[PDB]
């Protein structure tokens, strides 16, 4: 599994409605294998066409949280859903709060072809 | 002879061809879990037929399927043969409504083997719950464990539940978390448990609108149920005043509560003081969650003081998002260096910084340290910290699991961890690295490490 | 998605058609156990080819089938695939000989995921074992747990094994019970351990010719392995002098030994007193067997004194066949009434009599008592203490299991028991009644009890 | 399962040699379902034809261990094996000492036909 396919597994949900219900994260975090061994503490799904997220790799370059150069902020805000493990959760009972919203996304991009391999952050600038 | 089979499927679309292959297993298995497998009414009719002929079935878990009231009806009919020995049933998140509760109520009158029932994440409402309780009051109902989380219940459901508790001397666990039962609902349930002879082992009322005053009610329960092992009250506005009213019951000699879940309870450094007196007096208390309480560095000092004196035998401390800074880490460092009971420390989502993490590494690096699990997710750990961590991974030999998820590491930090974990002398079994960017070059090194050392699980 | 399946067959003859139906499960199951199922060579090629396409396989247990060196060789080839993830393998009692150790040894070099290997009850002999250690030595061998009970090994096998321990920092468990490795073999093994960096967790040397002098070797292991959790030394002539040599190591600040199994070790009240110094000082010791040692009532008195002191947190005590009399019962009675850690007491095969049993019942019936499991098999119990047993089963509410096997109870006494256990107020979950004669009418009554109260399992 | 068939399951092994090996009990206690849930602590198997044990019900009447009347001591000493659970055994690992011997047996008998339903004891009187 490439970090590129892993990015798709963990962060792409093109076909879902923006308006995620309160049970979306518990479902999806499980279906996309982010609750095996340990509960992934935070995760973001993007409700946009794959090519749109891929193009971000050719948009505004910005610094990644870890100080690497090759992150990119989306030109436009995107429909995303944030998933965040609750402060009560204990493996194997991973419970998530679901927060859908429209935000710019920042991804890291790598490879040939040059594609998203990491979801860095979301930005609320409007 | 003995022939025990189990089937556990999660998050799979099951073709008609795979389904046909599974049906003989459904007729044979002691344990069947089909979680989020896209089960429909028609498959519920196959399930029904297969279970009618399964004399071995002890556990059936169909959670997270859109069964609906009709689907559930069909599955319950499959449990109604004289051969049925089901002990555990889960219909969590199954689109069950108040309209399906009559059929569930009548079924529950006819399954004396059934001990555990999970109905969470189903919109049951008060009328459905009340109807259910009528079945549960039947002398033929021998349920001991009931989970009703997010069931759309209010305080009106608590009287019916209290009556079920009074009727069942064998009751073991009640969960009603995520229902707005509120102060009066909580009081009525507590009276119900107090009246009941049940040796209750676990009570969970998280996000229930439990109030400070309800802590006098719960005080009574903790004082009264020597059988009680687990009490979970997270996400309620208990406050330091609530802690002050609870802790008297926790200090009763007869209390042997093992696990206390009070995350996000409005507790500060002051209530933390009350809890420290409990920790020092009660070596029965093994697991404590204060996650998401604003304890600050003074709460951390108070906890660590208690963890450094004889008495406290706490085994796991969950203090994620407690508003701790680097300044508390010399106290946790002494704890790790000296305390021989504490095996798990979850201190994620605190601004410990490289300075604070470095101090933890110093304490854990001391000979004789015992910590097994350390969670340091989102603690502002950078590549600097990784040299300290790499050193501790070779100096300490008790640690089995380390979580560094969601920190600002990259290739250079991870490389240092790799150089330690790759060595035969490093006995780390699990390294959790969610939400961290590394290069495709590092990815290959990690996959190489995985392949060369399969005893170590690298999770992301 | 996840698809986790398991299959566990024991003591069953499998027709060619039944075997045909099972074989597909061998392609899918994470855990396969086929124990004493008359497996042959022909079935080994089947297993081999089925396992080769199984990407889930973590555990394979083929105990008690006459596979032979050839059968086994066949099965192992099924495991040499690039995606093999097997972690646990049992070939116990499979008719392997030293002749088959060459191939097994060579195969062992090629399975780095393999962590646990059971070879007990195979005539391996010294030559075979030495051939295996050649494999175990390969840095590609990652075994952490090895069971070699009844493998016809002598002292000559211990330096080969000592070399393996020295080679393995991740080693966790070694069992060599029921081999005459004797004083010299034991010393050599302990030296290999002391020299090893392994954080060993379990060491079992029961019926190995372990001597009193060897207890000085073992003392050094216990003092120096803080990771050690279980030490099994039963059926060895340790004696009171051996016990005294073990104690200094057990008393070491660093020792957190959890389980100490020293049944039939020639220990008397004298060695019992030395051991009670360890128990009062080490709260970490949770399980202790002294079964079959002649402790007498003095030994009971010492244990009960210790159980009534703060620092002893023993949870389980196994003192079956300890030459106790009814005189020890007032001591144990005080323990049951006052001690809040002891959950399990095995006191079977002691001449407690009806008088002694009523005294125990008085103690257990006291408010606040916590015992969960009481074994009183063959304690000269008759109908005359059944009113006491029946009363206790309603007054105490902690007890979950009661063993009254092999006593002189009749219909009258059994009836008094049924009268208690049938009540909703009685929370007993298991009643063991092996070798007790009751009428056809009592039989009917007990079978009805079983159907009518399925939370209570009656065993005979 | 009738009480008579229970008795055959737990105590009859007509076909095997009297000279049981050290591993006999380990195998037999498991095969005859006496190690489920809890290890049976002691058991005896009789290596005689079923008709020979059945004949005991028509021999010397003696009091049963618990005081019932309908026990019978065999006129002949019979080939038996005693299985006794070791002092270190802990469920599910049930280990047994095997002791083959010749002894008179005492059984309880009931029913029509009048058959053995309980193995009461062995006796050494010579």
Swiss-Prot record, chains A, D:
Its tissue distribution reads: Pancreas and other tissues and body fluids (indicating it may have other physiological functions besides its role in digestion).
Summarizing the annotation, the consequence of altering residue 38 to D is: Substantially decreases binding affinity for RNH1 but maintains high conformational stability
Q: Name one GO biological process term.
A: defense response to Gram-positive bacterium
Where is the protein situated, by its record's location annotation?
Answer: Secreted
Q: Which cysteines are joined by disulfide bonds?
A: 25-83, 39-94, 57-109, 64-71
What's the reported outcome of changing residue 66 to D?
Substantially decreases binding affinity for RNH1 but maintains high conformational stability
Record's keyword terms, sorted: Disulfide bond, Endonuclease, Glycoprotein, Hydrolase, Lyase, Nuclease, Secreted, Signal
EC number annotated for this UniProt entry: 4.6.1.18
Q: Which GO terms describe its molecular function?
A: lyase activity; nucleic acid binding; ribonuclease A activity; RNA nuclease activity
The enzyme class is lyase
Q: Which residues are glycosylated?
A: 33, 75, 87
| Segments for region (Disordered) | 4-24
Q: How is it modified after translation?
A: N-linked glycans are of complex type.
Please note every region of biased composition (Basic and acidic residues): 4-14
Active site located where? 11, 118
Question: Which residues hold substrate?
Answer: 6, 9, 40-44, 65, 84
Q: In UniProt terms, what function does this protein have? A: Endonuclease that catalyzes the cleavage of RNA on the 3' side of pyrimidine nucleotides. Acts on single-stranded and double-stranded RNA.
Query: Which family is this protein grouped under?
Result: Belongs to the pancreatic ribonuclease family.
What is the name of the protein in this document? Ribonuclease pancreatic
Curated annotation (Swiss-Prot), chains B, C:
What GO cellular-component annotations does this UniProt entry give? Answer: angiogenin-PRI complex; cytoplasm; cytosol; extracellular exosome; lamellipodium; nucleoplasm; nucleus; plasma membrane
Keyword Transferase listed: no
An example GO BP is: mRNA catabolic process
Give the residue ranges for region: 2 X 5 AA tandem repeats of S-L-D-I-Q: 1-10
UniProt KW keywords: Acetylation, Cytoplasm, Disease variant, Leucine-rich repeat, Nucleus, Phosphoprotein, Repeat
Task: Give the modified residues of type Phosphoserine.
Answer: 90
PTM description: The N-terminus is blocked.
Q: Which domain of life is it from?
A: Eukaryota
- The LRR repeat ranges on this chain: 19-47, 48-75, 76-104, 105-132, 133-161, 162-189, 190-218, 219-246, 247-275, 276-303, 304-332, 333-360, 361-389, 390-417, 418-446
Where is this protein primarily located?
A: cytoplasm
> Could you say which disease the record links this protein to?
Encephalitis, acute, infection-induced, 12: An autosomal recessive disorder apparent in infancy or early childhood, and characterized by acute encephalopathy triggered by viral infections and febrile illness. Neurologic features of the acute episodes include seizures, hemiplegia, decreased consciousness, hypotonia, abnormal posturing, feeding problems, and respiratory insufficiency. Disease severity is variable, ranging from death to normal neurologic outcomes.
UniProt subunit comment: Forms high-affinity heterodimers with RNASE1, ANG and RNASE2.
> Function, please?
Ribonuclease inhibitor which inhibits RNASE1, RNASE2 and angiogenin (ANG). May play a role in redox homeostasis. Required to inhibit the cytotoxic tRNA ribonuclease activity of ANG in the cytoplasm in absence of stress. Relocates to the nucleus in response to stress, relieving inhibition of ANG in the cytoplasm, and inhibiting the angiogenic activity of ANG in the nucleus.
- What is the name of the protein in this document? Ribonuclease inhibitor
Q: What is the lineage of its organism?
A: Eukaryota, Metazoa, Chordata, Craniata, Vertebrata
Q: Which gene encodes it?
A: RNH1
């Amino acid at each position: 599994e490439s970090r590129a396919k892993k990015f798709q597994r963990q962060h792409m949900d093109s076909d879902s409605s923006p308006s995620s219900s309160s049970t979306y994260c518990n479902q999806m975090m499980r279906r996309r294998n982010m609750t095996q061994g340990r509960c992934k503490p935070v995760n973001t799904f993007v409700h946009e066409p794959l090519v749109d997220v891929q193009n971000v790799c050719f948009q505004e370059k910005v610094t990644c949280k870890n100080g690497q150069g090759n992150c990119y902020k989306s030109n436009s805000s995107m429909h995303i859903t944030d998933c965040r493990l609750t402060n009560g959760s204990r493996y194997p009972n991973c419970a998530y709060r679901t927060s859908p919203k429209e935000r710019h996304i920042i991804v890291a991009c790598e490879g040939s072809p040059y594609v998203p391999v990491h979801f860095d952050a979301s930005v609320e600038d409007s | 002879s003995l022939d025990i089979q189990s089937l556990d499927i999660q998050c799979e679309e099951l073709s008609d061809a795979r389904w046909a292959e599974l049906l003989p297993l459904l007729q044979q298995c002691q344990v069947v879990r089909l979680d989020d497998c896209g089960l429909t009414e028609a498959r519920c009719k196959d399930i029904s037929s297969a279970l009618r002929v399964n004399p071995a079935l002890a556990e059936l878990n169909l959670r997270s399927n859109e069964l609906g009231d009709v689907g559930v009806h069909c599955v319950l009919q499959g449990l109604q043969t004289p051969s049925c020995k089901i002990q555990k049933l889960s219909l969590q998140n199954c689109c069950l409504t108040g309209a399906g509760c009559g059929v569930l109520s009548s079924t529950l009158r006819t399954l004396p083997t059934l001990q555990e029932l999970h109905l969470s994440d189903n919109l049951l409402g008060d009328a459905g719950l009340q109807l259910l309780c009528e079945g549960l009051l039947d002398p033929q109902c021998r349920l001991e464990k009931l989970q009703l989380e997010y069931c759309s219940l209010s305080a009106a459901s608590c009287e019916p539940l209290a009556s079920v508790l009074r009727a069942k001397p064998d009751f073991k666990e009640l969960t009603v978390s995520n229902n707005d039962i509120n102060e009066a609902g909580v009081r009525v349930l507590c009276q119900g448990l107090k009246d009941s002879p049940c040796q209750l082992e676990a009570l969970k009322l998280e996000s229930c609108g439990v109030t400070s005053d309800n802590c006098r009610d719960l005080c009574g329960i903790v004082a009264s149920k020597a059988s009680l092992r687990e009490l979970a009250l997270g996400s309620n506005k208990l406050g330091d005043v609530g802690m002050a009213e609870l802790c008297p019951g926790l200090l009763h000699p007869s209390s042997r509560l093992r696990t206390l879940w009070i995350w996000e309870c409005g507790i500060t450094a002051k209530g933390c003081g009350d809890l420290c007196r409990v920790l020092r007096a009660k070596e029965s208390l093994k697991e404590l969650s204060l996650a998401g309480n604003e304890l600050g560095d003074e709460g951390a000092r108070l906890l660590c003081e208690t963890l450094l004196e004889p008495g406290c035998q706490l085994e796991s401390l969950w203090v994620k998002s407690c508003s701790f800074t680097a300044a508390c880490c010399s106290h946790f460092s002494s704890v790790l260096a000296q305390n021989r009971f504490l095996l798990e420390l979850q201190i994620s989502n605190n601004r410990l910084e490289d300075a604070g993490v470095r101090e933890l590494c110093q304490g854990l690096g001391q000979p004789g340290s015992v910590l097994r699990v350390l969670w340091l997710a989102d603690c502002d750990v950078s590549d600097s910290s990784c040299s300290s961590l790499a050193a501790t991974l070779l100096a300490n030999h008790s640690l089995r699991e380390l979580d560094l998820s969601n920190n600002c590491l990259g290739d250079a930090g991870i490389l240092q961890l790799v150089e330690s974990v790759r060595q035969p002398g490093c006995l780390l079994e699990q390294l959790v690295l969610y939400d961290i960017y590394w290069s495709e070059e590092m990815e290959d090194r990690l996959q190489a490490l995985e392949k060369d050392k399969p005893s170590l699980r690298v999770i992301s």
